[PDB]
Write a protein that binds this DNA or RNA. Structure first.
Lengths: 601, 164, 87
RNA sequence: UAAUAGCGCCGCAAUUCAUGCUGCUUGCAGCCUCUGAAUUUUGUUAAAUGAGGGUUAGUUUGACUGCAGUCUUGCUUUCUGACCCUGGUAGCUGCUCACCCUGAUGCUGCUGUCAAUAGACAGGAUAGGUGCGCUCCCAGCAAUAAGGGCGCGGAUGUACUGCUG
């Protein structure tokens, strides 16, 4: 449901320079607190096993750095901004590593289990029919089927008769009469081996790196490498890998996770202003287009409404949720605080705009806070509970807000969206009780006046990829791409799909479980290419470059998110299902929506 | 049909220290094979055309040496003795020659490519890296068909007289 | 790259005889002269990513010539390092 | 002079139905006047796409209250228009070249005038090849993909853009 809106902040030099000095000084403990966990911390491998960072460890590394002679000059809210960012960096990175470990194990089981029909006969000492009969018994026992079959293979080895469970699993949890081609099986088993290899090469990932603005390592390495002689090829390359590294020009943003830690006001000139907790001397002026101003007026109205009411209304329902203050990169020459541009990005929960939507968040938080209190049931724990009980009483006192009746769709009408390489979207609207398609759309309809933009995107990707190649050979800085055009097209389709869902009173939009299509294609094309260029690895990589590149450029996750966002701002439910391997783009969309309807029970 | 004969090739016996590039080169002259033909016959594909150049960037694996062993009738453990021992760094750019010993055994010895070798100990002579008369660099050891310089046609055995 | 006069000046001072156009001591002295002038420009114009390619080549060539001379003759190597102010 | 072919786009001609057009049988009959999918074809002052590099806190897409009245901000991006340029000297620095053959995701390609030297002057995004483009093709160059040939000095213990500038 959340959105991010933005404004540039304007203020005389002295204020934009003082804030830069604090952020160039804050950017440094953002690096020292990563090193205190990157190498220093002894427990680190226990966290990699669990997949989660302990909720207090970054604060317990930061608390003694608050008096460090290098870091002591900063407000209490700038240290909380440091702790926030470093908590989120590792809390992300450990959760990336854990899912890769789980996938590597979850396929290492399968590479042991995947056997040819002849190997099942040898391993059982029995006929492939005896295996078909035992596979039929195993389905009869089972009737989460796939999970149950993996459990029944883990447990219950049963004199190697679990070989018949592997016969079900390779056949997609079904009986098969046909006996398979050993060349097709060799390609299949090779795809699994390639996926195991690539997962290990990925799982061996780099630790998080901080934004070192100082150039000190680079300058020290330059004067070392030019005046001294390396003792090894490894040392001479270690200096090369440092000297090639581009250094960062921007400090990490400030994060203000409490909405009240931004204070709003109106300037004499009638313009809006803002100030931050701990920087309450530095008034900043808001500059934003009238297409976004209504939120910045709402910020000040939410604040005035609470202050006019003796704090009896809660910022648990303030339209602003959190702010990220960032320096966007400028152009040309000048001091960093005169060259770059302070920009304030406000997280906003869009459903807090209206009274009917605010009531949803009131019920959502009142249920979550009630449960939290009953789960707690300490010293400072007594004050945490008083804060939660006080939020739970105050949240019932309403802000005066715009009214708009909630959208309601028909529980039987669904929009199916089918994504692919040639057709980025294609739509079928199904009445699932009639089994009747109400409408279909192809791309030429689904963004209408804008259909020239798909042809533009394909021209621009091809044109600009060649210009980047020509530019790199000359060391030109000019490096451009179609990324913002692809982002616009994915947003045009997201608006049109939801406008169509509203038009037909659909209860939900259905999006495919595409999953990791990029890695799957990369292993399929490699298992095949190894059969056509054996030993010539450069020829294996050249085999289907344009197909592999087009799959790595395929924006399916960004279109899926663009539709999710616009659907949830409108109130339409999102649902999911398996996308058919065969059929036209329309048939894919039709069967996808009907499948998601069948999954209701 | 065949007169009751087991399938065969012109097998060759390896010399006391020749390089895998040189041995494969002899094998594909004893039998008339191309480098990609020998790789195809072994079932390892284009791999052989690296090994003849000493392009061991990914090293010869146990499974690839066993595939060649089934063609050349030398076991994988005797094929491994024609490659550098574990951690002995070789260089494949300058092909190098003793020439004094090439009269005692006409072969390219693997040891002349080691980064640690600068003189032949049997003869106490500096190793060559180009033809002593015309300064031409030697062909890859698989191509040592004539046993002489390819530009000025001076026998490798006569380069014994022109070194150190 | 060096002026004509500057090359002639460097080869005449590191060359062991009037015949040295390019012994290992002359070749390392010309790479050393280049690297010093290039570090004074590349530390100032930090954006000049075409000159970092030139520096990293030119330093790596010097190291190969020094490793060759170290094994060939340690006395020539020791004297060369002194005369070029290297460590 | 040349650019025949291949590949990607753009419509134009058809053919087959529908997500469309007439009926009531709310699912059939009927056709292509539209709006759209699929295949095939085509390059006819047909039609439609059409990347030489740059320029505005630009305009419209906005909020609230019963389609009328108030308030309005200059953020981040995609197009369509329009206009401008096709650059100037003052240092620093990378790469490339003895000389040849093959010729690469190599460079170059507009109009007019003077020279017919390789370059100036004046116009200009129509700018080599086709309806429009390419790593394709044609023409010239090719040392600055790569491989091979190979001359004379230094060095020659594996280093040698290290020399011929």
């Amino acid at each position: 449901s959340q959105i991010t809106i933005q404004a540039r902040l304007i203020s005389f030099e002295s204020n934009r320079q003082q804030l830069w000095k604090l952020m160039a000084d804050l950017n440094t403990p953002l690096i020292n607190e990563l090193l205190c966990q990157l190498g220093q911390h002894p427990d680190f491998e226990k966290w990699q096993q669990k997949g989660k960072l302990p909720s207090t460890v970054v604060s317990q590394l930061c608390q003694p750095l608050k008096t460090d002679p290098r870091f002591a000059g900063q407000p209490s809210r700038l240290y909380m901004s440091a702790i926030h960012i470093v908590d989120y960096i590792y809390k992300s990175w450990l959760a990336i590593q854990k899912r890769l470990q789980q996938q590597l194990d979850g396929k290492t089981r399968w590479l042991e289990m995947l056997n040819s029909d002849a190997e099942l006969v040898e391993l059982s000492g029995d006929t492939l029919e005896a295996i078909r009969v035992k596979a039929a018994e195993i389905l009869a026992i089972a009737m989460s089927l796939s999970k149950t079959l993996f459990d029944a293979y883990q447990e219950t080895e049963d004199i190697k008769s679990r070989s018949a469970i592997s016969y079900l699993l390779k056949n997609g949890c079904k009986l098969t009469d046909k006996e398979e081609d050993s060349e097709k099986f060799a390609k299949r088993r090779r795809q699994v081996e390639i996926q195991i290899q690539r997962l290990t090469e990925k799982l061996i990932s780099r630790m998080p790196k901080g934004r070192d603005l100082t150039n000190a390592k680079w300058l020290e390495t330059l004067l070392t490498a030019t005046t001294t002689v390396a003792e090894d090829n490894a040392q001479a390359k270690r200096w090369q890998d440092i000297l090639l590294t581009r250094s960062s020009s921007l400090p990490f943003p400030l994060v203000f996770e409490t909405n009240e830690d931004m204070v709003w006001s109106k300037n004499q000139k009638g313009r809006l202003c803002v100030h931050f907790n701990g920087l309450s001397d530095l008034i900043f002026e808001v500059y934003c287009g009238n297409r976004q101003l209504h939120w910045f007026q709402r910020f000040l109205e939410d604040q005035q409404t609470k202050r006019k009411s003796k704090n009896q209304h809660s910022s648990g329902l303030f339209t602003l949720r959190n702010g990220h203050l960032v320096w966007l990169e400028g152009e040309g020459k000048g001091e960093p605080w005169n060259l770059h541009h302070l920009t304030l990005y406000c997280c906003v929960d869009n459903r807090l705009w209206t009274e009917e939507g605010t009531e949803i968040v009131r019920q959502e938080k009142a249920d979550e806070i009630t449960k939290f209190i009953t789960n707690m049931k300490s010293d400072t724990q007594q004050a945490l509970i008083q804060r939660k009980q006080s939020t739970l009483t105050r949240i019932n006192n309403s802000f005066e807000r715009p009214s708009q009746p909630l959208y309601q769709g028909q529980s039987h009408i669904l929009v199916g969206v089918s994504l692919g390489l040639e057709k980025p979207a294609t739509v079928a609207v199904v009445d699932a009780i009639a089994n009747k398609v109400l409408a279909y759309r192809s791309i030429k309809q689904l963004l209408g006046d804008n259909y020239e933009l798909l042809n533009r995107q394909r021209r621009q990707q091809q044109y600009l990829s060649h210009e980047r190649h020509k530019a790199q050979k000359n060391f030109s800085p000019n490096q451009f791409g179609a990324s913002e055009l692809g982002q616009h097209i994915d947003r045009l389709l997201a608006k049109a799909i939801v406008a169509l869902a509203r038009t037909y009173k659909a209860g939900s939009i259905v999006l495919p479980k595409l999953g990791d299509m990029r890695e799957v294609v990369q292993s399929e094309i490699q298992a095949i290419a190894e059969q056509k260029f054996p030993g010539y690895i450069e020829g294996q990589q050249k085999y289907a470059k344009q197909y592999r590149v087009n799959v790595h450029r395929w924006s399916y996750g960004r279109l899926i998110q663009s539709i999710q966002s616009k659907a949830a701002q409108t109130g339409i439910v999102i649902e999911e299902g398996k996308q058919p391997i065969r059929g036209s783009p329309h048939d894919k969309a039709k069967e996808l929506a009907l499948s998601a309807y069948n999954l209701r029970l | 049909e065949a007169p009751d004969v087991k399938p065969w090739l012109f097998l060759i016996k390896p010399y006391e220290g020749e390089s895998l590039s040189h041995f494969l080169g002899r094998f594909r002259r004893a039998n008339h094979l191309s480098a990609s033909g020998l790789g195809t016959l072994a079932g390892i594909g284009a791999i052989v055309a690296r090994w003849e150049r000493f392009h061991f960037n990914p090293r010869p694996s146990q499974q690839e040496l066993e595939a060649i062993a089934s063609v050349v009738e030398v076991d994988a453990q005797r094929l491994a003795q024609m490659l550098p021992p574990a951690g002995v760094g070789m260089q494949h750019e300058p092909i190098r020659l003793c020439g004094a010993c090439y009269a005692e055994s006409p072969c390219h010895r693997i040891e002349w490519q080691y980064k640690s070798v600068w003189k032949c100990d049997r003869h106490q002579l500096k190793i060559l890296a180009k033809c002593p008369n015309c300064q031409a660099p030697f062909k890859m050891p698989a191509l040592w068909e004539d046993g002489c310089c390819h530009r000025c046609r001076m026998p490798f055995a006569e380069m014994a007289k022109l070194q150190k | 790259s060096l002026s004509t006069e500057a090359t002639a000046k460097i080869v005449s001072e590191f060359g062991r005889d009037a015949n040295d156009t390019g012994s290992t001591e002359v070749q390392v002295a010309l790479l050393t002269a280049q690297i010093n002038h290039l570090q004074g420009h590349f530390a100032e114009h930090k954006k000049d990513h075409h000159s970092r390619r030139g520096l990293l080549r030119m330093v790596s060539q010097r190291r190969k010539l020094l490793d060759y001379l170290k094994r060939k003759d340690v006395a020539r190597y020791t004297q060369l390092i002194e005369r070029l102010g290297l460590r």
